[PDB]
Amino acid sequence: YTDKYDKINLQEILENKRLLESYMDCVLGKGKCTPEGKELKDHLQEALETGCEKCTEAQEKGAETSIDYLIKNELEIWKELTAHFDPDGKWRKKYEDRAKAKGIVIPE
């Protein structure tokens, strides 16, 4: 039911920036989405980058998941989150930590 845009979608959307545009109302405020869905996604996609990875269990599991598809497919989107949180690119090393300690294929 809420497999996309609405709610229980994280990775099924994160999988393609076009699908991001689908739950993008949740994240940025654009199209259509559900309030409860927005809350879960906001905290979680936050945990993905410079937000709070070590927050809740939902956020930590979610961070892992979202860090995975974003860095491995949707790199420009990542840069937008970067520009939103730390546009200085300071915590690139925490990104480094997050990605390469979990086993996300990034080059070093």
**Region label for 5, one of left (φ > 0), alpha (ψ between -120 and 50) or beta (otherwise):** left
Domain with residue 100: its CATH number is: 1.10.2080.10
Method of determination used here: NMR
Number of compact structural domains in the chain: 1
3-state SS, one letter per residue, for 4-43: CCCCCCCHHHHCCHHHHHHHHHHHCCCCCCCHHHHHHHHH
Look-up of token digits 């974003």: 70
**Residue 93 burial by CB count (10 A; 0-12/13-18/19+): exposed, middle or buried?**
exposed
Helices then strands, counting H and E runs in the chain, come out as 6, 0
For residue 56, the one-letter residue type is T
